[PDB]
Design an enzyme around this catalytic site. Structure first.
Site, mmCIF file in Angstrom:
data_model
loop_
_atom_site.group_PDB
_atom_site.id
_atom_site.type_symbol
_atom_site.label_atom_id
_atom_site.label_comp_id
_atom_site.label_asym_id
_atom_site.label_seq_id
_atom_site.Cartn_x
_atom_site.Cartn_y
_atom_site.Cartn_z
ATOM 1 N N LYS A 146 -51.152 113.072 26.964
ATOM 2 C CA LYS A 146 -49.743 113.438 26.075
ATOM 3 C C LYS A 146 -49.845 114.932 25.701
ATOM 4 O O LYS A 146 -51.017 115.572 25.950
ATOM 5 C CB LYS A 146 -49.748 112.789 24.869
ATOM 6 N N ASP A 175 -40.611 113.721 27.096
ATOM 7 C CA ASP A 175 -40.604 112.967 25.793
ATOM 8 C C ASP A 175 -39.556 113.309 24.719
ATOM 9 O O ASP A 175 -38.678 113.803 25.331
ATOM 10 C CB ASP A 175 -42.275 113.297 25.263
#
Lengths: 408, 408, 408, 408, 408
Positions: E101, E141
């Site tokens: 991430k 995201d």
């Protein structure tokens, strides 16, 4: 020499076909031979130098493909020979692969898991220069498995810098391997046994089979020929003895028993017999899936089987070959018959390249489809030269490699 | 075997020094051996497969360094042995290089310039995987030269994609080579001849020298020992005979004459003598710069020289070694004495890496500086073990390689 | 055409020497020509497509070396020609470099620093494929400088992934550049002026010099010829006029004045004269360091100078060449005379490769050393062909490129 | 100019749609143009320099895709134009490819197989910098084929160091090529003919077709339109003449005859007619699969066909276009109609990437699926602008390339 | 801390299963954390330094996979935690991916499209070192989308030198994206809702569903559960309120209305209710697809649903978990339930690797197939430990990562 002995077999088929003299010479010698001497820190702390070999025979049709051997008796010769066979083995199956092999002179038994993992890594790092997912894709051989193969994959990624996983085949399913790896070879043999049943005009249900040996190949060959083909496995054999039963065995059970107790012998409901006796049984198909020379000069004339599907390597000897063909006994050659492994290995590499994995049924169908093909492709060449299936297979193989070699 | 014979010499010095058993084993076996079988299109149109070898023995102290041999008798063994020596040879000179060698089984004489250039390229492409300006830097050996080496450099660039030129040494000056390449070896021998003269307390001007052989090394050794040192070359020899003259020869002239007429014999103003006679002359320094075994058991006791500076390879035999040391005759070993070549080869590689070339005077000074050094470094080890210079040299060498092998 | 015009000059010297017909053809055509059309976001927000060229003429002797041009009139032809010259220019100087050049059809004046920086980057990224520290090393040319060259260096690193800095030359000293870049060209001209003075048997102190033009080259040439050589700069010229003074000028002062006030004219203590008048002054050495055709058919017969050291490009015309040589006036060609820049540029690249920078004194000595050499190397070829120095220079150049082209 | 002429056609559709002025400019100029002058050793031993071009027009949607031309009249212009078309051609088919093309000014007829193979390699090595399996994937064009393309593939691997095989398309099936390559183009034309019939409301069985030309495209177009569609090929033509037969020909036979005897003319059971006559036949669909300008101003008004499926390149001229659309005659454009090749070429590249090859049926279905699509996608844009199919195709193409160019 | 809070949840399942202590520690800490501070030229001309993070937690099972966050409150902690989840999330879905991430501390709202694009590029260039199509494949995201993701893809290619497009997922369809991306997550939730209906023995047609939230997931979950499953969405909710209707809503209409007018509230034919009220409705399945803590200690005892399919992240709290399981209410965990996204993302990457794109139906089937699988795989582990589905999921995940970690 192991190698020269192979070159001879090649030279034979090389003649039956008009193959340019000089072109045959390049197909004879192997492209690359890498020999490495690398140290390894042993558990007790002392360093031990080991000898390793990686041989890339031919690559004309694709990147070299071949397993790695962990044996204390392995020799450059042996490797070269084995690589040499891979070239044709892959060619007959028609796989975008070349031919290679390798091994380390070491007895795994005297090494600890830690030491093995160590040696396995240093080795793969030492021969990295010569391999790659597009140059040479190792695989498991004698004394190596999914565990060793995974250390290989790892060590490579650590050097390369990113996930490859197409660098080797025979990996654990959960780590980029493929389904149907175990039953591979056996299923191949099954496909062949059926096809032979065809050319011989026998009925799969009425047919009777005798399988010599009960290892991976033996068991699955017996299991599937029995379940999917419907034939009657009337006899199977261990490294000890064999058991008969014209009524037919229940391979399913036989397997469990073989697992529980070291052998198939002692198994009730079975008339004990010797290995050499099994080879002479009165059955339709005989699947030699154990040791070499099983069928030799001595028993060549005794075999009553109409078809001999070679599940192992070199089960039948040259002399026996002559005798067998003379007597008109179909002999499906090993390079074709037990190439079910190399085939599912190609699928694993494919599945890896696209990081998408097929499920069993697919791997199966694909395997059977290509086996059927190869079989027929060999069959044709057979009639076109009126030679034995083994020679036909080498011709077909030598053909494809030559054409590619030529087009380039 | 050629290799085993070298390993023996190593094992000797390996004992004189406390060298870890297992560490010695790694220093014994070579890291990489690559054998290639590649095709080549012959002028007449047919393809001929050739065998080539590249061997990287040890690399602990730097990238492998060693020439390429074009000979029909070259064998893996011979190469391994030669590679093996490079390892120590460079080590004693203290060069950031390892040890390697290679060769192709071919007779250049039966090949056309076009075919040679072809074979030379295909070869270099076949062993590219194992070499690089920072892995293995080939160089000329028997039957190869600046011309072959330039095809090598080219072929490499074409594959690599950009100018390298540090990939090989011994290239033509106008193409990345270095000055002083020709006189290199000779100058080295000269430097040693002089140094041997010092420890012995002899005066360079009053000294007298006898050089056996008159090839590259012989001529330059004679030329420079005469001009720069001021000694009197009282005798030189050909592959035919030799010429004496206590008054002193004029190497300058002798060279021209040797060029004009096939040999130094016949040369006026010179008392003809045999080769075996030259070896026994009554001179201060004797420079065996010709064939091996020159100084053997038979003449070992006859040599009246106070110092024997080996300009060739293995001029004196093991037995002669013993006798000579017993008699207290200083014998500057070959690995040190005729390493002036490898040394100037290091400079070429250096000059190349930085694409900046030094002029003669520099190459000279650099060469002499390092020779003087190595000489002394060996000298020390000699007293520290009270062994003969040759052994002292192998110890010093074996030492450096081990340390590096250890630190890593 | 600009290119064909150059090829002609080449063809001339190509004949004077026995140069294989087909070999000359490869030396004629350029290896690579890359043309790119790339967009650039202008300050106001709209995109504008630009045309850029990078040409690698010859590379036999090393990686292509040549500047980048920012001009609205730049054409493939112009670049090709210029690249073509670099090949010989570097060859005569004997630099491990090839020949290349490039440019972008744009007028920097109508672009903001932001837009320029932008275009400069997009360009370098578009021609990245063809360049590298070992393939093609750009440099500043017309309308480009250390600033543009630094954006280049940066953009490259960002793509490549690590500090290169040998990717381009002419960078700011604090960013990998070299000292002595400014005075480079001039110092070169100086060295030549002096050498010409020697072969002519003139005394540097007694000599008198006339420098046409007062830009970078003019000033430094005048400054150093005066200070280091001790000659008397009796006349210099601006883009406007010129000033005489047989007593000798004080270049030091003249420089300041030229800085303060737009020109050298108006400068007191100086007899005003025209540019065409300067060319005919009665001095020993005349340094045409301004515009082309300065010395042409018209004044060819008027020049009283014994030596003409070309500080600019093509100051004298072909016809003038003939006349001048006929009259026996030594004419040091530009390719040699004003190559001091390319030379110090080589050094910059060298210093970069090894990330170690030399100080002024070194850069100077190195520069002078090579100039002296080139001069002599050309001198020899001159006598060997009894041609004029310019031709001798092209021969020497064409020779070196051919040999290398041949050896490969 | 060939290029400007193409830009014009583009400009037209560029207007019909609101396309940002500056964005259109980038879509106009090509990204990269590489021109190489490389030597080649001719059989007789002399070197000959050749000119080669590789042009990458646009890449926004993927790596450049386009064939290589061996012709003595090939010019930068021609290539640029051709590259330019590929960009839109692939775009309308919706393939992850860009647009590129290349060629060498050479007449293959005057070169030996050996010389060709040589030149073919040197070329590919010279343009390696700009190409790759993910940058530019060449393919066969005029005077090049699977044989030349295989030398390309080889030469690349030898440089790259590993098997690529996705570097070029149109390779022999046994060396990484794809099945259905031959029938490709034709099958495409077939699919269109059907779809048009559909749009025209004609019945495939009742329809009658006239195919001008009998090369690869012509034969297969005729063969498949006949067999799979069921239409009646009432006339086909050679480079000599044509043959009529309203009853319908047996393309199968016609093909053999065309093979045996140089032409389709002379073939019995066929009313001989001229080429210009064929174009005017009273048939439903006319497939101009031969030379350009076939349908021009002169005959524009004479064509009685309801649909013209362009199997060749530029069969009908601009003027003819206007007339034909005016008369309401559907004209399936080439960029769409004869793109069946580029399409199967994409599949080859795909099959390569994953080293898994699909069988004929798949290649077929895939080809037809995409053709059907492209057709419809173009159809829609046609109604949305009420323009002719050719313009609709260029819009659709110019649209996709712009969007991608924008998103980036 | 966000991270520690996650590690706790892991530690729980880590105990239920006998997991080697030290092995658990490596599974706990993340492999790589890269933090970058990069400048960006703002529209107004001033430079602003930004902070960016990319974290590769675990990679044992494949290359790291995870989106990029553009938020002004993003912190190393948050990222680490999110990466940590990805590892298990992909593991339970059984995807050849790892866990990663990243994010940049920036508020997109205060940045211009130009500035964003700029920042987006500089970032991707700054973290290039750690990513690749085979190391780390970013994705969109919070506050990033197909547009940002496309700038990423571009910037990468410009640096890498060739088309990749497998470097990031969530790209526009016309640029390498995949079909079914939008409905992905929802469809996944649907699949689960159905499967739960199964284990609970409820009839999809008779069942009633309440979906909390109406964003992407909510709408599609509601849409598909309604259309394909046939259940009755009796209530949906906005960020404002909710609407009831036991008769059943027409999600189709509800969607349009939600588009037209900011919310679902106000929508006629719907009994307005609060969010917390919805959670307590008397329905079969409750799909919390909005904010976290939705189901907490306070309402835990109030929920009347037989199944809670987590469409969002952490909708239900730990305490609520205990209560819910105690009450015997099936709770399909988020890591499994809303993993439909990561799954279709895998497909996009796959499609990219082989440059061949599947059509909707395929993407759908593939998605549903794997969802069904994971569900069951989790179900089994659930009975084998008699734990709640969430724990079962973590065990299954922790298991697979460990085995891979072990085999390597």
């Amino acid at each position: 020499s192991l190698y020269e002995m192979a070159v001879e077999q090649f030279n034979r088929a090389a003649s039956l076909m008009d193959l340019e003299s000089d072109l045959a010479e390049v197909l004879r010698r192997p492209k690359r031979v890498l020999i490495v001497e690398f140290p390894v820190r042993m558990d007790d702390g002392h360093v031990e130098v080991f000898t390793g070999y990686r041989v890339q025979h031919n690559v004309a049709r694709g990147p070299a493909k071949g397993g790695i051997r962990y044996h204390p008796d392995v020799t450059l010769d042996e490797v070269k020979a084995l690589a040499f066979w891979m070239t044709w083995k892959t060619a007959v199956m028609n796989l975008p692969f070349g031919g290679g092999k390798g091994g380390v002179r070491v007895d795994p038994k005297k090494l600890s898991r830690r030491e093995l993992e160590r040696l396995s890594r240093r080795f793969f790092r030492e021969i990295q220069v010569i391999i790659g997912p597009y140059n040479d894709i190792p695989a498991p051989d004698v004394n190596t498995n999914a565990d060793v193969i995974a250390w290989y994959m790892d060590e490579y990624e650590m050097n390369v810098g990113h996930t490859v996983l197409g660098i080797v085949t025979g990996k654990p399913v959960e780590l980029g391997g493929s389904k149907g790896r175990e039953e591979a070879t056996g299923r191949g043999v099954k496909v062949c046994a059926g096809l032979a049943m065809d050319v011989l005009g026998i009925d799969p249900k009425k047919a009777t089979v005798a399988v010599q040996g009960f290892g991976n190949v033996g068991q699955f060959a017996a299991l599937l020929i029995s379940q999917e083909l419907g034939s009657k496995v009337v006899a199977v054999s261990d490294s000890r003895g064999g058991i008969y039963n014209p009524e037919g065995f229940d391979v399913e059970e036989l397997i469990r028993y073989k697992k529980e107790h070291g052998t198939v012998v002692t198994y009730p409901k079975g008339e004990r017999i010797t290995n050499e006796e099994l080879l002479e049984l009165d059955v339709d198909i005989l699947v030699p899936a154990a040791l070499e020379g099983a069928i030799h000069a001595g028993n060549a004339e005794r075999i009553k089987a109409k078809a001999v599907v070679e599940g192992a390597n070199g089960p039948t000897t040259p002399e026996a070959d002559e005798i067998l063909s003379r007597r008109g006994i179909l002999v499906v050659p090993d390079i074709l018959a037990n190439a079910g492994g190399v085939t599912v290995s190609y699928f694993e590499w494919v599945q890896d390249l696209q990081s998408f994995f097929w499920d069993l049924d697919q791997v199966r169908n694909a395997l059977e489809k290509m086996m059927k093909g190869a079989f027929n492709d060999v069959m044709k060449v057979k009639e076109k030269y009126n030679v034995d299936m083994r020679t036909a297979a080498y011709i077909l193989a030598i053909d494809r490699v030559a054409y590619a070699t030529k087009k380039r």
